[PDB]
Amino acid sequence: PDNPQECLLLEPGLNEIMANSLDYNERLWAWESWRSEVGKQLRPLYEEYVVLKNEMARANHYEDYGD
Amino acid sequence: GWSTDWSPYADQSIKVRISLKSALGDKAYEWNDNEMYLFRSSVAYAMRQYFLKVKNQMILFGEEDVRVANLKPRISFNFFVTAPKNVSDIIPRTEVEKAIRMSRSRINDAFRLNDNSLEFLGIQPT
Amino acid sequence: TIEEQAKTFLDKFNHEAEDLFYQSSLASWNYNTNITEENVQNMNNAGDKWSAFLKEQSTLAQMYPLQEIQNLTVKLQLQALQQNGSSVLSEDKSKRLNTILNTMSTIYSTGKVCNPDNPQECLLLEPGLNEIMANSLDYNERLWAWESWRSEVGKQLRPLYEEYVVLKNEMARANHYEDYGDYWRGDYEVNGVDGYDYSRGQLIEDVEHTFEEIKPLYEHLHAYVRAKLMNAYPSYISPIGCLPAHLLGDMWGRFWTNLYSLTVPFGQKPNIDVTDAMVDQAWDAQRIFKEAEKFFVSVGLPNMTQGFWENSMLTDPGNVQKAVCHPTAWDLGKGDFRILMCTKVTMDDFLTAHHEMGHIQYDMAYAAQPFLLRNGANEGFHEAVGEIMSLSAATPKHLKSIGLLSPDFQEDNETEINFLLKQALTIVGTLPFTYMLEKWRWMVFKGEIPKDQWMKKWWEMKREIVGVVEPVPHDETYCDPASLFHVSNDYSFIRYYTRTLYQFQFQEALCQAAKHEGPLHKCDISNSTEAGQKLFNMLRLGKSEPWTLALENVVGAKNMNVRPLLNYFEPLFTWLKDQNKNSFVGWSTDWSPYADQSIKVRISLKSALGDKAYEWNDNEMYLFRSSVAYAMRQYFLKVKNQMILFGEEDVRVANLKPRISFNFFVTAPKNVSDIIPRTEVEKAIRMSRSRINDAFRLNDNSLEFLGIQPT
Amino acid sequence: INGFDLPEGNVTQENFVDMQQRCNASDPAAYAQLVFQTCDINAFLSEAVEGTGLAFIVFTEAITKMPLSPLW
Numbered sequence: 001p002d003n004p005q006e007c008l009l010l011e012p013g014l015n016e017i018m019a020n021s022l023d024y025n026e027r028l029w030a031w032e033s034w035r036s037e038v039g040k041q042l043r044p045l046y047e048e049y050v051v052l053k054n055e056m057a058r059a060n061h062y063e064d065y066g067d
Numbered sequence: 068g069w070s071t072d073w074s075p076y077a078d079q080s081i082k083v084r085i086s087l088k089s090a091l092g093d094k095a096y097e098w099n100d101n102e103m104y105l106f107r108s109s110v111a112y113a114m115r116q117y118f119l120k121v122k123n124q125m126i127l128f129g130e131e132d133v134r135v136a137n138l139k140p141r142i143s144f145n146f147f148v149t150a151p152k153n154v155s156d157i158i159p160r161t162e163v164e165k166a167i168r169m170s171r172s173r174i175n176d177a178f179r180l181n182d183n184s185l186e187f188l189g190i191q192p193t
Numbered sequence: 194t195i196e197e198q199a200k201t202f203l204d205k206f207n208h209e210a211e212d213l214f215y216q217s218s219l220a221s222w223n224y225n226t227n228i229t230e231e232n233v234q235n236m237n238n239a240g241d242k243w244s245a246f247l248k249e250q251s252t253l254a255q256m257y258p259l260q261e262i263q264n265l266t267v268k269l270q271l272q273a274l275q276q277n278g279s280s281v282l283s284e285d286k287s288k289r290l291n292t293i294l295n296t297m298s299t300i301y302s303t304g305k306v307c308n309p310d311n312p313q314e315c316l317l318l319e320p321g322l323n324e325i326m327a328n329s330l331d332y333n334e335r336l337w338a339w340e341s342w343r344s345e346v347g348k349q350l351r352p353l354y355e356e357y358v359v360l361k362n363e364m365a366r367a368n369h370y371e372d373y374g375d376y377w378r379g380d381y382e383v384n385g386v387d388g389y390d391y392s393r394g395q396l397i398e399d400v401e402h403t404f405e406e407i408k409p410l411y412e413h414l415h416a417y418v419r420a421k422l423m424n425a426y427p428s429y430i431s432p433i434g435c436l437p438a439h440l441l442g443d444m445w446g447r448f449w450t451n452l453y454s455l456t457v458p459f460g461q462k463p464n465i466d467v468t469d470a471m472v473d474q475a476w477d478a479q480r481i482f483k484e485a486e487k488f489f490v491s492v493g494l495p496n497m498t499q500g501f502w503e504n505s506m507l508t509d510p511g512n513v514q515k516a517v518c519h520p521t522a523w524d525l526g527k528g529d530f531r532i533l534m535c536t537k538v539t540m541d542d543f544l545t546a547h548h549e550m551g552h553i554q555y556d557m558a559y560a561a562q563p564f565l566l567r568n569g570a571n572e573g574f575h576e577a578v579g580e581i582m583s584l585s586a587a588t589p590k591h592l593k594s595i596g597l598l599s600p601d602f603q604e605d606n607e608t609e610i611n612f613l614l615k616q617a618l619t620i621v622g623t624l625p626f627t628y629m630l631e632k633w634r635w636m637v638f639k640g641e642i643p644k645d646q647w648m649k650k651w652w653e654m655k656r657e658i659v660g661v662v663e664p665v666p667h668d669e670t671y672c673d674p675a676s677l678f679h680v681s682n683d684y685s686f687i688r689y690y691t692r693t694l695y696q697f698q699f700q701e702a703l704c705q706a707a708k709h710e711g712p713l714h715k716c717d718i719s720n721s722t723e724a725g726q727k728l729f730n731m732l733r734l735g736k737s738e739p740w741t742l743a744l745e746n747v748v749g750a751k752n753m754n755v756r757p758l759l760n761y762f763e764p765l766f767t768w769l770k771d772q773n774k775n776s777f778v779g780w781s782t783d784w785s786p787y788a789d790q791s792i793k794v795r796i797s798l799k800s801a802l803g804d805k806a807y808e809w810n811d812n813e814m815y816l817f818r819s820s821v822a823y824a825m826r827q828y829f830l831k832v833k834n835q836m837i838l839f840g841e842e843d844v845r846v847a848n849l850k851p852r853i854s855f856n857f858f859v860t861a862p863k864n865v866s867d868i869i870p871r872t873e874v875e876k877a878i879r880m881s882r883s884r885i886n887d888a889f890r891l892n893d894n895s896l897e898f899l900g901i902q903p904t
Numbered sequence: 905i906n907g908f909d910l911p912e913g914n915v916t917q918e919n920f921v922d923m924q925q926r927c928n929a930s931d932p933a934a935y936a937q938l939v940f941q942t943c944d945i946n947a948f949l950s951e952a953v954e955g956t957g958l959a960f961i962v963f964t965e966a967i968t969k970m971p972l973s974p975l976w
C-alpha cells in the first residue's frame with residue numbers, strides 16, 4: 001500500500017510473510033489482499049467451472065462434481 | 068472450545084437497523100445492493116466531513132472502507148469504518164459515532180428516513 | 194593582489210582537476226565499454242573522489258570575491274566554482290529533497306499500468322505504453338494508455354512534486370535567486386560585457402516574442418494534421434477544435450513524428466534511403482565514420498585524433514562483451530576524444546555519426562580553454578552544432594557526392610514537401626509543447642500558478658498555446674506535467690526551444706558562407722572553409738566569451754531569431770496554406786472530446802436553504818458523484834436488468850464554479866473509453882432525481898440538472 | 905449569475921449595475937447575450953388595469969400570496 005511499485009507474488013513474498021512475519025498488521029495485509037485480488041478474479045471463474053464440472057459429472061452418470 | 072460469535076472487528080462494529088414500512092410505509096423503496104452502496108457512500112461522506120472538521124483532516128474515506136456485515140431481512144447490519152488504504156487501521160466506534168451524529172440528519176435525508184426509522188444502535192438521537 | 198591570489202588558486206585547481214577528472218571520465222568510459230561489478234565500483238570511487246575534490250576547491254574559491262576579480266577568465270572560473278547550490282540547503286532539507294528526487298525518478302522508471310481486462314499483464318512506460326502511443330492506432334487503446342499512465346503514476350508524483358517545488362525554491366532563494374525558475378534562467382545570463390549582457394528575465398521575453406512569430410506556421414501545421422487525423426479517427430476530432438492529447442503519436446505529444454504515416458503529403462512519393470546503397474557498397478561503421486571525418490575536413494575542421502580511431506566503440510561489442518549502446522561523444526580529457534555507439538549499416542547511423550562527430554569537433558575546438566570554460570556557450574549551443582551536421586549530411590546532394598545516391602536521380606518537390614512535413618512534425622511540433630511546459634514550470638516556481646490551479650492552468654495553457662485538449666478532465670489530484678521524464682527528473686526544458694532556433698540561425702549563416710542559391714532546406718555546407726571558419730570561431734570560444742558574442746561569431750546576432758527556422762519551412766508553409774484554404778486555420782479552446790455527453794448541473798443551496806445553508810465542499814461533491822453512480826446502477830439494474838458497478842470515479846466532473854455549477858459525464862465502471870450516453874444518464878437522473886434532491890435537501894428548481902425537467 | 909456563473913448571493917440589488925458592468929468588461933461577448941429587464945415599482949404603480957381587473961385580477965392575485973388565502 002505504501003509503495004505500489006513494490007508488488008509481492010504469493011509463493012515468494014506473501015508466503016514469507018504469512019510463514020515468517022509475525023506483525024498483526026503485515027499478516028492481515030497479506031491475508032486480506034490475497035483474497036481481495038486473486039480470490040475476486042477466481043470468483044466468477046470458479047462459478048462457471050462448478051457448472052461445467054457438474055454437467056460433465058452428471059453426463060458421466062454422477063450426482064454432482066463432488067459425487 | 069471457541070465462540071462462533073467472536074469477531075476481531077465486532078468491537079468497532081456499529082449495528083444499524085433501517086425501518087421503511089414504519090416511516091415510508093406506502094411507496095417505501097426496497098433496500099437493495101444499490102441502497103447498501105448509497106449507505107456506505109453516505110458513511111464515507113460523514114467520516115470525511117467529521118475528520119476534515121473535528122480533526123481538520125481531509126481523509127478520503129470510501130464506501131469500501133465501510134466494512135458492513137451480518138445483513139438481515141430486517142435491513143439490520145453491523146459496520147466498522149477503516150482507513151482509506153489501511154485495513155489494519157480501523158476507525159474507533161467513538162470517532163465513527165461522532166461522524167454519524169454530525170451527519171445523522173443528512174444520512175436520514177439520503178434514505179428519506181429519520182432517527183426512529185434509521186436506528187444507529189448506540190448512536191442516541193437528541 | 195586579490196585577483197592574483199584568485200588566479201594562482203584557479204591555476205592549481207585547473208591542473209589537479211584535469212588529471213583527477215581524467216580518471217573519473219576514463220573510469221566511466223571503461224564501465225560504458227564493459228558492464229562488470231568491478232567496473233561499477235571503478236567509476237563509483239572515481240566519481241566520489243572527483244566530486245569531493247571539487248567540493249573542497251569550491252569552498253576555497255569563495256576566498257576570492259569577483260567584486261575585486263577583474264580578469265573575466267579568472268572571474269568566470271571563480272564564479273563557476275563559488276556556486277554553493279544545494280549545499281546552501283540544511284542537511285535535513287537537502288536529504289528530504291534528494292529522497293523526493295529519487296522517489297520521483299523511481300516511480301517514473303518502475304511505474305507499470307495493468308490491463309483492465311487482465312490485471313496480470315502490467316505494462317511499464319519505456320516499452321509497453323510507448324509502443325502503444327507510437328504504433329497503436331486504436332482510439333480506445335491509446336486513450337487507455339494515456340489516461341492510465343497519468344492516473345497511476347501521475348497521482349504518485351503530485352505530492353512529491355509539491356514538496357520538490359518548495360525545497361527547490363528555498364535552495365535557489367538562499368542561492369540569491371527569485372525562484373527555481375530564475376535559478377534555471379541563470380544559464381543564459383551575461384553581465385559585465387559591453388552590449389553582450391543578457392538578463393535572466395530577458396530569456397522569458399525573447400522566448401515569448403520568438404514564439405509569436407512561429408504561431409502562424411504551427412497553426413497551419415496543426416490544421417493540416419487535424420484534417421488528416423479526422424480521417425484516421427472519424428467522429429473523434431472537431432475540424433474547428435483542439436487535438437485529443439492521446440492521438441499525437443506519443444505519450445505527451447512532445448513530437449508529432451509518429452503522425453507521419455497518417456500525414457504523408459505524397460504517399461506515392463518515398464524519401465531518400467541510401468542504407469541499401471551503404472550495404473551494397475559494404476559500408477561498415479568505420480567506413481561511415483571516415484565519411485563523417487571527410488565531411489568535417491572538407492569544411493576545414495581538424496582531422497579526427499588517431500587516438501579516437503584507436504580507442505572508440507564505433508561498432509556493437511558483437512561478442513558476449515556487455516557494453517551500453519547510445520551514440521555518445523567522450524571528452525575524457527588530456528586530449529582524449531572517443532565515440533561509443535553500436536553502429537550499423539544504416540542511413541540513420543550515417544547521420545548519427547556526423548551528429549556525434551560534430552560534438553567531438555566542438556570538444557576538440559574548446560579543449561584548449563580553461564578546464565571550467567570547456568563547454569558550449571549555453572545549454573542549447575552544443576546540441577545545435579550536432580544538428581546542423583546531420584542536416585548538411587542528409588541532403589541528397591551530400592549522399593550523391595558521398596557515393597550513395599546515384600546523382601542521375603532527380604529530387605522531387607513532392608518528396609521535398611514530404612521531407613519538410615516530417616521535419617516539421619519533429620521540429621515545429623515540439624516548439625509549443627516546449628514553450629508551454631517551461632512557461633507553466635516558471636509560473637509554478639514563481640507562485641503565479643497556485644497549487645489549487647496547477648492542473649487547471651496546465652490544461653488551459655495546453656488548449657490555448659499547443660491547441661491540444663485532454664480526452665478526460667484531470668483535477669488537482671493529477672500531475673500530468675510530472676508524468677514527463679524531465680519534470681519528474683528535475684531537468685530544464687527551454688534548452689530544446691533555444692537549441693532549435695540556434696540550429697537554424699547557425700545553418701543559415703554557414704550556408705550564406707557556403708554561398709547557397711537554392712531553398713535552405715537543401716543546403717550542403719560540405720567543401721566550404723568559410724562556413725568552417727565562422728563555425729570554428731564560436732567552436733574554439735567555449736564558455737570564455739558570452740553566448741551573445743559566440744552568436745555574433747557565427748550568426749552575427751546576440752539573441753535567438755526564428756526567421757531562419759521559418760525560412761527553412763517556407764516551402765512547406767506555402768504548401769500548407771493551400772491545403773488549409775478550405776480548412777479553418779486555428780482552434781477553439783471550448784470543444785472537448787467529452788462535452789457531447791456532459792450534463793451541466795447548477796446547485797442552489799441558499800435558494801432552497803437560506804440560513805443553515807451548508808458550504809458545498811469536496812465532500813459534497815464526493816457525495817454528488819456517489820449519488821449519480823447510485824442512480825446509474827438503479828437505472829441499469831431496473832431498465833436494463835444490468836448489475837453495472839458504477840463508482841463515484843466513473844462520474845467525471847469538469848468546470849466547477851462558485852455558482853456551484855459544473856459539467857459531469859459517466860463512464861463504464863472500468864472503461865474510460867466507454868462513456869455512458871447522455872440519453873441513458875438523463876433517464877437514470879429522471880428515475881432517481883427526487884432521491885438526489887433529498888440527499889442535498891434540494892429540489893428540481895435548486896438542483897438544476899440542465900436538460901432534465903419535471904412534468 | 906447564470907451567465908458569468910457568479911456565487912448565489914454574491915450579486916444583490918445593492919450591487920447589480922456594478923456587477924453587470926464589471927461582467928460586461930470581463931466578457932462583453934456573452935454579456936451581449938445577457939438579456940435584461942427595465943423595471944421600476946414607480947412604473948409598476950402607474951400600470952392601469954382595464955375593466956373589472958382591480959377586483960378579479962389584482963385583489964384575487966394578492967389574496968393568494970397572503971396566508972389563510974381562502975378566509976381572505
Ligand SMILES: *[C@@H]1O[C@H](CO)[C@@H](O[C@@H]2O[C@H](CO)[C@@H](O)[C@H](O)[C@H]2NC(C)=O)[C@H](O)[C@H]1NC(C)=O
Pocket residue numbers: 002024025153154155156157
Ligand atoms: C495500519 O493500521 C495499523 C493499526 O492501526 C497500524 O499498526 C499500528 O502501528 C502503530 C505504529 O507502529 C503501533 O503503535 C500500533 O500498535 C499498531 N497497531 C496494531 C494493531 O498493530 C499500522 O502501522 C498502519 N499502517 C500504516 C501504513 O499506517
Ligand SMILES: *[C@@H]1O[C@H](CO)[C@@H](O[C@@H]2O[C@H](CO)[C@@H](O)[C@H](O)[C@H]2NC(C)=O)[C@H](O)[C@H]1NC(C)=O
Pocket residue numbers: 264266267
Ligand atoms: C587573463 O588571464 C589569461 C590566462 O593566462 C591571460 O591569457 C594569457 O595572455 C598572455 C598574453 O597574450 C599569453 O602569453 C598567455 O599564454 C595567455 N594564457 C592563457 C592560458 O590564456 C590573459 O592575457 C589575461 N588578461 C589580462 C587582462 O591580462
Ligand SMILES: *[C@@H]1O[C@H](CO)[C@@H](O[C@@H]2O[C@H](CO)[C@@H](O)[C@H](O)[C@H]2NC(C)=O)[C@H](O)[C@H]1NC(C)=O
Pocket residue numbers: 255256275276277278281367368369
Ligand atoms: C555561498 O556561500 C558563501 C559563504 O557563506 C556566501 O558568501 C558569503 O556571503 C556573506 C554575505 O555577504 C558574507 O558575509 C560572507 O563573508 C561570504 N563568504 C564567502 C567567503 O564567500 C555566498 O554568498 C553563497 N552564495 C550562494 C550561491 O548561495
Ligand SMILES: *[C@@H]1O[C@H](CO)[C@@H](O[C@@H]2O[C@H](CO)[C@@H](O)[C@H](O)[C@H]2NC(C)=O)[C@H](O)[C@H]1NC(C)=O
Pocket residue numbers: 491590591593594595596717719720
Ligand atoms: C567535396 O569534394 C570532394 C572531391 O571531389 C567530393 O568527393 C567526391 O565525390 C564524388 C561524387 O561521389 C566522387 O565521384 C569523387 O570520387 C569524390 N572524390 C573524393 C576526393 O572523395 C565530395 O563529395 C565533395 N563534397 C560535397 C558534397 O560538396
Ligand SMILES: *[C@@H]1O[C@H](CO)[C@@H](O[C@@H]2O[C@H](CO)[C@@H](O)[C@H](O)[C@H]2NC(C)=O)[C@H](O)[C@H]1NC(C)=O
Pocket residue numbers: 606607610
Ligand atoms: C512540383 O512542381 C510541379 C511543376 O509545376 C507541380 O505540378 C503542378 O501541380 C499543380 C497542382 O497539382 C498543377 O495545378 C500544375 O498544373 C502542375 N504543373 C506541372 C507543370 O506539373 C507540383 O504540384 C509540385 N509539387 C508540389 C508538392 O507542389
Ligand SMILES: *[C@@H]1O[C@H](CO)[C@@H](O[C@@H]2O[C@H](CO)[C@@H](O)[C@H](O)[C@H]2NC(C)=O)[C@H](O)[C@H]1NC(C)=O
Pocket residue numbers: 309310331332333864865866867868
Ligand atoms: C471500452 O469502451 C470503448 C468505447 O465504447 C469500446 O470501443 C468500442 O467498443 C464497441 C463495442 O465492442 C465497438 O463496436 C467499437 O468499434 C469500439 N470502438 C473502436 C474505436 O473500435 C471498447 O471496446 C470498450 N472495451 C472494453 C474493455 O469494454
